[model samples]
Target chain A: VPSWPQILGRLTDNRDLARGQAAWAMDQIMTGNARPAQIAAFAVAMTMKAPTADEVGELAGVMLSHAHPLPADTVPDDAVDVVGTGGDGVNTVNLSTMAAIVVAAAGVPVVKHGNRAALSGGADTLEALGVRIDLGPDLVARSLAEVGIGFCFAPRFHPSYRHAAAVRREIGVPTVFNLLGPLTNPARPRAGLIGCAFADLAEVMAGVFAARRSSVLVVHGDDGLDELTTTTTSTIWRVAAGSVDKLTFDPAGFGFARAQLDQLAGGDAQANAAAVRAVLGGARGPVRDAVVLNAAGAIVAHAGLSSRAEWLPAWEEGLRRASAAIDTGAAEQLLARWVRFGRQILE
Target chain B: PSWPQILGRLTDNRDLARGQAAWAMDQIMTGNARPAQIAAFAVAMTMKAPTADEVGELAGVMLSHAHPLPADTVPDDAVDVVGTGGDGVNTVNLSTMAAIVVAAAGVPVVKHGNRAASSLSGGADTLEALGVRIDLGPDLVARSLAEVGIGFCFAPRFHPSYRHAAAVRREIGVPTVFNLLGPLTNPARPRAGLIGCAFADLAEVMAGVFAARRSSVLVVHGDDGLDELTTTTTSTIWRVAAGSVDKLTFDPAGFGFARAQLDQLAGGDAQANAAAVRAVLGGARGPVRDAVVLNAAGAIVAHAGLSSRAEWLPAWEEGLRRASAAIDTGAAEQLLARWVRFGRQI
Candidate 1:
């Protein structure tokens, strides 16, 4: 194994690390063998010279190997993950969480992984909705088997992360480990809809997900939202098997009218939880439309289509399916049942 | 006052301005910075290649905090011979031995040094191993210079404020701005000095620091990677005098000295290095003695500031003869013994 200085030296020189080397360095960091100074130096140097997909994927692979796994039989074959890198500072009402409910109501399984420390994060919204947010891997697996959706509390599944938790907090800046959040779902979903705050990282995330054999749509809004925004065209990299294809997607192409950014503004967890309820209760407006758009993307993502030619029509079918789930009241009914199920487990 | 933003800016590849650089050193030197911040700042600046303005500003801040020597305590022409000690070599202490020769030749010498940060043994460590007390206070240091023509100003004793950075510097085990400041901020504030820099770029940087001060300094670096004036390869010198800087390439063969392999001057720990210095000062001839004579000659020229090659060549040859005679006639050896005895008495 190379020393921390050796690994950091290569990064500062703008040299890319191979898979094994990256894995070894991350393991040292996760095991607390590396000093905080070394960790901070590594974070800064790697950020200055951005890490490659192979390096990121290898690090995520190590994190995954150390995580508690969901039983394979408990997971649906079409399970999809919906999450974002969350550093955009946009503060939308956890659209991916609301959309996950809509997608699962449309008959696709969603294994959403998230944390609660940030405002309006998926775990916080679900907690406000009366679902127990700290379920173990088995209970999360059961949630997926029964409710067609499960929330993986990041801290519960990835306990090894505690070693680096303090240093990451002290650094007060995003490192590659932040990007690993969306890529390291313990449920190991076969498909995903991942949103990146920075446009340049969308392609890199696609490469990481593709290398992990998960078909995914990695996206960034031109207006700087982590989730797809109605105010402008969104950049998306569609990942299937080993292929990554970039596409500029517009809401207009899907027959959706342009909406102002304030129309999607969200608030604290309690406010966002109420917004999630309203969207599922068939509330009409920009927020519901925003949920419908992203849920449609998640549904199409679950199909894992191998070609770019199939996406537009697939997206159209997905929109129809998502609208029916909310209008027919299935999305609202499923959330109520899941909330009741969580309360039952607590008793 | 916090490091997150300052480190963030540097990590984003932005250079700190002169005032900002001074602010950073203020934090670092006063022990206000976190260990991680110090490490990140050092590595980032190393990779970014800190500008001369930034280095010069930080060096000035460090000197301001250093203990000042009393005026007129030592002669006006007292000279210092020090190196920026992170040359990544295990060679004998050439500058330390050369200072003895220069002092024996009648130039007052104030040698400022620290324990090893990069090498196996630094000038202070070698001095300790050679039975010198190595930590003479201000008055004793001046007395040594006045009576024996040589004195050793141990850095930690003089720059007590540097205690804050000493542990972090040792832990990081890499040369930071502190390494460059050591040669620049000798508490005695010698008017003329010979400084060997490990990197040519930093040699140029140190030249600017010296250019702004009222001093004549020669900064030398070997093209083959040794910091001292080398017989193995060509060396570059940035001569700073009278508010101007001039660059010169030096070849020992061109100056009528035989080129010697660096291995012939290979050294070891404090005990081994002390033995080597004794052999050289006791008139043992070879690459080691030749290296000492060549470095002493550089200090001699720096002290006098001979500008033209015509004046430099004769003066350099004359300085070499004087240094050689100091070693052969036992003057350098007797001076070393006398300085050590005086250091022990104090």
Candidate 2:
């Protein structure tokens, strides 16, 4: 029932008015009465302003209501997530997926919620690795209990957002809708490592997560990667206890060398899926280092430490555990078990 | 084939660079797309501060597709006077009064207006309050042009081409560039005219659009933001004739009158504003009188080829005499009653 122009008029005014209007627009978008052009322009104008953290949360809150919650049996005692807003355009490997698998191998529950349509390094990569990502809520929960990592495909979970997909593609650019994917994970994980492609968004998102009473780590690489790139001093913000805290450190500060980005660029599903196994098997390369680096973020975020330095010795021990999971082939073993489990049940 | 890309790029400039905004907008508007589709673009385009040329180009598209009042049917010396009505200040219908005065001054006047677009129940509403016939048939409108010396060309009747645009305004419930185009693309196609700019900076741009194909045109903006030759503020004027443009600022005191307080011009609803109109034209002197006199005199000057307001005034005083006599002697009142009868009998 919302008037599109009136809502856009307020957004057209100031940041103070914009987030609240975007919140109202999400209802109309879900209502199925708003026009395509209005939906198209709303996404464009909102993203053009670089959607504030509150506005992003406003949109996520609407989608969250429509989300299918983890089935009663699938709910985890505690869940951790690794994801990023996808417009970084580096087309790098699915580093977050690697992080999720490694974390799961390190004895943490992982719920990976995503769509294959919008992301540059999308969830389709999991399919390439023979992993089941299209399970319904009940099966998704079963996957988690049986394998420690569950893939909750986005489209089947949030049907209302499915109507928006055409406009997102027709608009032909990344919009606030693209940013909403990572923020609206159906499981509502208690902790997450959120990678922002835009450098300044780290603090904003951290504040939002903290306000939601969830512990989170938001990171952005100054040199243009969305993850904790070894190529630059990555800025980090942590949210816990209703407050956001920020810090900056280079890969060297973590006792590692800068790894060239192109050295880790990925391609065809077959090759990328092979690379995932290689990295999990502790292959010595830039790709393994990148995987291990993000996996450390997953482990650290899952632990909810106040700062990396305060828990440096604890993080070192965590990183050694992640490294050991791969060197000892435990992470690769989990991937094989998941592929076998998916093949037998899904087929 | 690539049209949606144009629409999308304009909608999706993720950096907010507004890269090629004007170009993309002009394309969509001119591409014969439905206005319902383009209205949202205007709504989005409203989010940013547009360039003057972008607005000028937008008005240009409306002007291009507009229903032109062909010169063959209209007389050799007809003149029009109207204003863009988004000023948010609704006083008596000054342009309507001024046009009536211009017609009384022995010049032919063709006024363009719509029922709903009046200044908050002030323009066509005043005409209705006065019982002037607005719903004239085509032959009746052109016939009245030569017979009555003034023909109110109701805009919706003449601009059937604006069906898409009409829906655009009604659907969005906000004035877009189409509101500004009503006066610029008058179906009367008068030989000379006076236009009032709604936005403060639009006088120069609107003058250029009007001047290119007309003999003489006057565009004004009142410094106080009302779309009139507002008496309380120094009015900005642009006079374009014979393909040349001249700019001037005319003070209210130049005509031997003190600036009228703005509150004295506050118009009530249609009936009340119409009552104020009759009171002013009946020579009840006040801010409304000064306001009507300034705009009517500008129309006369534009219609008369006079250079200076000093010389133009004696003529305007003569105009005021004829206009005042037409009202006080009950002549202007009867003109409307008579026109309504003529149309009804037809």
Candidate 3:
């Protein structure tokens, strides 16, 4: 009998042999082929299954076999990748994207593995910021060295996903591949701060990274936001030093008054980008407080800070420094430097 | 949850079986059913596996809706010898043509059959090759059964509920538990059945299946792969009578016949095999005759009060003598002529 994934694919689609091909690809991925077709199918199927932690762990195993690993030499202990699964239906400014600059300014080397705004405004923002997201290990290393942060856009690194590009577009649905984005950081960051829309997924993804023996923190706001929310209780699953924990708290826990879901709502990419810019520029308000708290949690997880209180001051200082960097053109200059390097290599 | 709706769906649509039958067939033919539905469907069917009684009722329903018949009974002592249809063999038809030779041996047979569901040529196709009229009503069927000792009931006509299952079966594309229902639901409800099965597990399932409904049955599964005992293989027999079940085995050589080569037992097409039936009835002795005798003897032994296979051999010889005496001269010709005449009216 074909595996469940293969059988599901064939039966789910009506086209002749589509299911068979998908099944074959899934078989290849599970059985350790990691070939272009297999990887593509695995990505597409993931879009459908939304990939449980076990499945993602299996995929990580496959990636480990095929892709070049990050050098353990220069990499700091407990560094985390702050990322999103991205299909939250909210085009908020890229909070993680901006926070990476702040974390780097705070002397924490942030390795951000992300894609162009697939359905929103962040891709253009990153493009405009001159951040070079590439697949090359040496270039990735160089980006981290020169800018204290590296954005490894996935497709350039995972060559096998090329075949999935057309099918993923044609299906026009979020597949397991969407979830894979956050799971498969080319640099293999030991610690990850991830956000997803679904709560069960938060638990699942947290379990996945933990199983892979990584320190991870996963968060999803109860009001369906993919990040920390000031408007409602935010759900968090933490895997640190090999221990797992869950936390749920509303705005009051973060020293802010409660707000409605609409207050925190960033409707589209432009709105989100504007919100993210305001927050990173030290604009004081609920959104900025939420972003700062989230960035603080990620930094705390990365730096192995014992308590949120210990990390809060640095987080505030990082936010202030990031705002100054943006105002004084230091952040913009770093973005320019990365973008030029990216265009020179990719073009 | 209710069998009636699914049964009604089957009767109305000619496709769809309830629960796992629907689920399994859908998987085999269609590809898959919803994952959420799989657990429910599987549990429901597992809890309520279709019984022989249910099968018999459904078979009656299916026959009433779909079976096209030839008019009249061919003769007395003739049997429509068949198993309920779901043996998943890619083998040739044994019971279909074997009934003709039994009829030739002075027993009238109403062989109600159809094209193969999962096999090669089912009974209707085998008879169709012999210029037998396939479409007849009850009157013609009764007349044929009376006169010729043989009449074929194409099952699709008799069983209307099969339609409900057609699409689901096509979707799943694999045989489910329902495939075993046909052998038990012979519309004629023949007194004696030479039911051939594909697997040994089916031997017990089918024995219990037949024992619950029918009076006498010989459920045979060719241990070598063929549904019938081809001298080339060992055969398992589940003999059911009244409410009792008896198990036995027989090799071709045990019947004082030469062990037939597997290739010689191979039936090509319906037409060719039907011709072989005619020849066997005409008394041309060979492997086919020996094989037919073994099966027909089983049938005769089951239907008639014969002591055993040993006692029945002589009775079978006498029956064969009576058959040759009747068909070889003018009686068989007259029977055929009457069938063609009355069949046209039907």
Candidate 4:
């Protein structure tokens, strides 16, 4: 163990080196080569010194190297993976996952990379929604082609992470891996809609995605929502052609009346499922309206749709079409068909 | 079952507190805590500041477990010169040799210090290099004060509780509360302290700490990075006396010296630096002499009942004369002899 001064010297000079070491250490911890306590200390020290984009990329590379990778043939182009760093401490429903479904309904193929809820209520909601998230490339490809939305559960893809699982459980708190989740989507999507807890992280995450040559939209609600919220001002870092533009938008700017955050924060997965149902069933209320507004923003970013004004009506129209597809049992049938195929492999 | 359990339960709802307490405990338990937990705690604590009361309590616990030594029977006005170890500059032996010069000049001195945490050689290592037995028990330490007018306390022997953090400190491999606690928890608990801090905020806080603990202290830090008096630049000092804190600034001009180059004060490898201390104590004069005199002057003014630096200079000169005589007659050699005899037993 290097002394704190020596370790600090290495970390402070270029944080990427520290993160690479952390990634390496995490690999060691998983393999039982390093002790849990040692890894935990290093994790805390790195967090105190906020990670640079290069450090985050190094961590992503390490995880990718150690973990199973999805087949290249199954990968989608122009696909956007939406997830947050998840330290906002808000237990809101899975808005990003729902938006993926809405985007899929709008004719964009969706590869929703996510994990079981570690800090929030999103994982349980997805499980309840009958989303058959599997790691196998065939299952993921079949889901994307048939169901229009594929959920790639992370742990199944990254089995080496299992080694640190007990240590993390013992520590029983958020670690650097929580923040790395959004930046290290297994499929390495061509575009991303990353929700972060803090505003300063917007550009940092943007740089990480930009370095990977991805068209990315990094969002953080000024009110501390990790995702785009209808109730508050949202900060956006849009990356294209390797340049990042800071964009700000509010609900009223999109021709939608401002709604209270409480109106949109479906308390639990059951409530979230109901909101998703109402939005997909074309139920007009704050919940449906908010989801539509958020989904449209993602669609506009994903499709390279130029006009925000033009996208709102199209978003509402997409919401209506998705609702009709779900209400007429097309979405349900699509969901059932994928579940059957996933079950066949399990059997 | 322990403080960790109690603090953990209290911080259940507060992620920041729980995380910091958990991390601090993990650091204490296993020097290398989980990387994730360590990162979370560091970020959380940096955002949520530590309370002074908590810092004090922690320091108090560490002090209780540390090796306890009775104050040396030096002159009642003796000063212990030391610094919190995190200043990060690997400067030469400015304060330690200065304490020797003060004692040599006929003023009693009891220097409480340790090996370097962030620097190349701390006071203990420098003293050890001079062939003084550092592990002397309390009785021999007092004898050194009574006979040679200077007693040195090696910190590790005085503070046993530090063992709990040895692994953690080694593993985490950085400065912690323990480093800051070093200057505060002198085994002798000297009447006056000339302490140094790495950061400015610590100067005020440590001054207040010394004052509250009822010790007169002068906490100093070089704006250029050395913890000791750097002749090249102005240094800030916070003097705590009788429960009042007075802040002051001083330059090397008053010492009848030009600003010394920073490299001149750079401490070489520990053993080589000890040779320099012997030369300076043997009355060799140069940048090292001027630097030692400046620091000794501060100790003289603080410890020797001097009214001001002006009054203290002559006393400092006389103290230097006595130190030279003691070294010439081999009395200083005898002091090291006694140190080794009693030091080994402890």
Question: What DockQ does each listed candidate score?
Answer: 0.42, 0.23, 0.04, 0.25
Give the CA lDDT, 0 to 100, for residue B207 in model 4.
73
- Top lDDT model: 1
B269 Cα displacement, candidate 3 (Å): 14
Q: Write the per-residue lDDT of candidate 3 for residues A110-210, one digit (tens) a residue.
A: 78877776545445556544444444777777777776777676766766554444444433335455566777777777776788866656777787777
For candidate 2, give the lDDT.
0.71
Docking class of 3: incorrect
Give per-residue CA lDDT, model 2, range B1-346, as digits (tens): 2334544444443212333444444455455644434554554455543444555555555455555554466786788888888777777788888887667656788888776453567577778887777867556677777777788878777766566656656655544545666776676667688888877655676777665665677788888877778888798888777777789886768666678777777877778877886787666877787787778777877776533344445755665456555555665555555555666676
Candidate structures ordered by lDDT, highest first: 1, 2, 4, 3
Task: Give Cα distance to truth, residue A50, candidate 1, Å.
Answer: 2.8
For model 1 chain A, where is the 10-residue window of minimal lDDT? Answer: A303-312
Q: How much of the real interface does each model capture, measured as fnat?
A: 0.35, 0.13, 0.00, 0.34
Model 2 chain A scores worst on lDDT over the 10 consecutive residues at A10-19
TM-scores of the models, in the given order?
Answer: 0.90, 0.80, 0.50, 0.79
Q: What is candidate 1's local distance difference test score? A: 0.82
C-alpha lDDT (0 to 100) for residue B111 of candidate 4: 81
